Design a binder for this molecule. Sequence first.
Ligand SMILES: [Mg+2]
Ligand SMILES: [Mg+2]
Ligand SMILES: [Mg+2]
Ligand SMILES: [Mg+2]
Ligand SMILES: [Mg+2]
Ligand SMILES: [Mg+2]
Ligand SMILES: [Mg+2]
Ligand SMILES: [Mg+2]
Ligand SMILES: [Mg+2]
Ligand SMILES: [Mg+2]
Ligand SMILES: [Mg+2]
Ligand SMILES: [Mg+2]
Ligand SMILES: [Mg+2]
Ligand SMILES: [Mg+2]
Ligand SMILES: [Mg+2]
Ligand SMILES: [Mg+2]
Ligand SMILES: [Mg+2]
Ligand SMILES: [Mg+2]
Ligand SMILES: [Mg+2]
Ligand SMILES: [Mg+2]
Ligand SMILES: [Mg+2]
Ligand SMILES: [Mg+2]
Ligand SMILES: [Mg+2]
Ligand SMILES: [Mg+2]
Ligand SMILES: [Mg+2]
Ligand SMILES: [Mg+2]
Ligand SMILES: [Zn+2]
Lengths: 64, 71
Amino acid sequence: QPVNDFIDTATRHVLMRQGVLGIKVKIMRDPAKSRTGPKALPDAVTIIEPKEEEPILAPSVKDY
Amino acid sequence: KKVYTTPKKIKHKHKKVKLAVLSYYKVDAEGKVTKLRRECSNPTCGAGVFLANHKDRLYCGKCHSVYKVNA
RNA sequence: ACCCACUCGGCACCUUACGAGAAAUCAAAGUCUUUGGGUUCUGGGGGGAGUAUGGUCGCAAGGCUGAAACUUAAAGGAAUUGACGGAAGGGCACCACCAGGAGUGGAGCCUGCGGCUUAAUUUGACUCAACACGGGGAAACUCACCAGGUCCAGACACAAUAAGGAUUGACAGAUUGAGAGCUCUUUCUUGAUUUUGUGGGUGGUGGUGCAUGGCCGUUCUUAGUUGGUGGAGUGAUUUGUCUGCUUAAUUGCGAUAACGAACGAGACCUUAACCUACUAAAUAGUGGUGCUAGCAUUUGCUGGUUAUCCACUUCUUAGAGGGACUAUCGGUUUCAAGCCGAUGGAAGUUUGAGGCAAUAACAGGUCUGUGAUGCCCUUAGACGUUCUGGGCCGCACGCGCGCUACACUGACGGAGCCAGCGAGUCUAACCUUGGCCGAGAGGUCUUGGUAAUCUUGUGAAACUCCGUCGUGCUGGGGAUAGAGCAUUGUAAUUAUUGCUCUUCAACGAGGAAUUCCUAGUAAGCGCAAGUCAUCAGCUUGCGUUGAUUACGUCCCUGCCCUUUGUACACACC
Ligand SMILES: [Mg+2]
Ligand SMILES: [Mg+2]
Ligand SMILES: [Mg+2]
Ligand SMILES: [Mg+2]
Ligand SMILES: [Mg+2]
Ligand SMILES: [Mg+2]
Ligand SMILES: [Mg+2]
Ligand SMILES: [Mg+2]
Ligand SMILES: [Mg+2]
Ligand SMILES: [Mg+2]
Ligand SMILES: [Mg+2]
Ligand SMILES: [Mg+2]
Ligand SMILES: [Mg+2]
Ligand SMILES: [Mg+2]
Ligand SMILES: [Mg+2]
Ligand SMILES: [Mg+2]
Ligand SMILES: [Mg+2]
Ligand SMILES: [Mg+2]
Ligand SMILES: [Mg+2]
Ligand SMILES: [Mg+2]
Ligand SMILES: [Mg+2]
Ligand SMILES: [Mg+2]
Ligand SMILES: [Mg+2]
Ligand SMILES: [Mg+2]
Ligand SMILES: [Mg+2]
Ligand SMILES: [Mg+2]
Ligand SMILES: [Zn+2]
């Protein structure tokens, strides 16, 4: 499906003196810009980066 | 392929004759002009057009074919 | 005789490489451009050729010595990647077997192919990967073929003819299959649109698919491709990408001069399964209520009523979510990836079935899909086109896909009586309910539907029940043929199709061989759609009834992978 989604293909027939040539063009668009559709490949698996903690600290409690 | 055959005799064409024509008309000694060959009473053939004289047969050629007036 | 240590001198092997080399490799092939221990011998591109000639030795065969002319741009070495093998080792698979199912191969017919025949029987394609294929079911059309008849739709440029008329058309007759003015007779008509010529176009189901594009099929039911940093090598390259294990998978685990990634696989997408949770619905449906029929009557049971109202969303529809991750437990295993069993679960075989699908190869098929196309051919007595008629169907016979059958798990006759995927008419005649008529086929009058609204609950068929028949080519089987009725169409003859009576063939389970298939599958059974005016024995799908037997292997066959050989690289054609 991402093919449907992200690649755009066109074949044109250039008619030259000696015969004709077939031109095929493929363009793959950046998924991260998709504006209106999946923002990535189905493949894509990002893990959010954890936060270096400064734990310890014996109990205590705030009052408001 | 094969090429050529024929029991001879190739069909021709048409010519549409010649004729230095429209002498048919008679003008007297200065100079009354009388029409030879009657003209056609069809409202699509304003009386300039004439009728050919065959046998029985008078014929409007301007009517590309049509109508068979006969005297 | 044996064991240990040492030491001369041998035949060898192992590991390394400071070092050498074009490399393969080498304790010499090292101590060489930082070039000298002593010495002998041989080579100077490839052929011509160890040939000619002379000498010499030999019994001979022949040995030693040993040229040139001429010809030629490479011959050659080592290694690398491919490609191929009628070498070796592993694997993978119902287009392979195993266990079986259902058959085809035998028969009648249908249908494609060859062959023959023919005026013509248009043509492409011939192992899987040609032969119910070209969506190829051809009565005209299609159509390309054959017998014949018209027309130019021959752009444009120059030239010529020529307004005293360049050219156009025709009635009747002749003619012709033809009510074609094709041609001719005849004599009007037309008015610069044409005609003639050359040049140039143009069309062409003409050729070339071995000139091409595009598309498609095949290898492939396969698992392969590539770069970053590091390691190896002067280099092309290699390692990564690997013994093993595991997987449908270069899928992973693991091993590890590699580490970490990308394409392909997976992911993704579509469809089938699960939601009494969500949002709803007179184009879907339930319960209640009225109005109402029948049977009982004791409240009951079974129906009618596109709105008589009320409520709901379980069944139907389709939006949004949710769900499964081989989960829990256990066995097995390098307790690794995984595989196996049990439980739970709508669902645990990639959940089932599909879509999409890398790099690369083929002189695979298609110029007969294209106003895609190069080149060649042809172009007015056309290979353009159209009209009439025939032909693709022609039948000693070979081959392939099929359909129907050989009956009693059946045929026939009454009766029960249940799907799913679909499709339908505007400037038109498509899908057709209902009523009459008709034995049937059909006919006729109306009708609903541009559709979840009507056809249609598509009341489909196998199937189920009660009967008749009773093993007899029988009432199994329905070829062939006669006679009649209708439908489509301008047209049905060589019989489009449908109905009816009659005729009642082979076929008594099919030799050698051979196809397909593992679960809602095989097989049986029908339906809708494509085609379609009319014609399905074909296909694409659909649901209905619903098994037996594997859940393995490398024996056959096909392929893939390593190893290995190569003088191949246009790559064993
Ligand atoms: Mg090699
Ligand atoms: Mg078997
Ligand atoms: Mg058998
Ligand atoms: Mg014709
Ligand atoms: Mg010309
Ligand atoms: Mg010419
Ligand atoms: Mg053409
Ligand atoms: Mg080709
Ligand atoms: Mg091609
Ligand atoms: Mg050919
Ligand atoms: Mg399979
Ligand atoms: Mg290096
Ligand atoms: Mg490899
Ligand atoms: Mg619901
Ligand atoms: Mg269970
Ligand atoms: Mg070829
Ligand atoms: Mg083509
Ligand atoms: Mg045919
Ligand atoms: Mg076939
Ligand atoms: Mg019956
Ligand atoms: Mg009658
Ligand atoms: Mg109406
Ligand atoms: Mg009988
Ligand atoms: Mg019968
Ligand atoms: Mg049909
Ligand atoms: Mg067909
Ligand atoms: Zn007139």
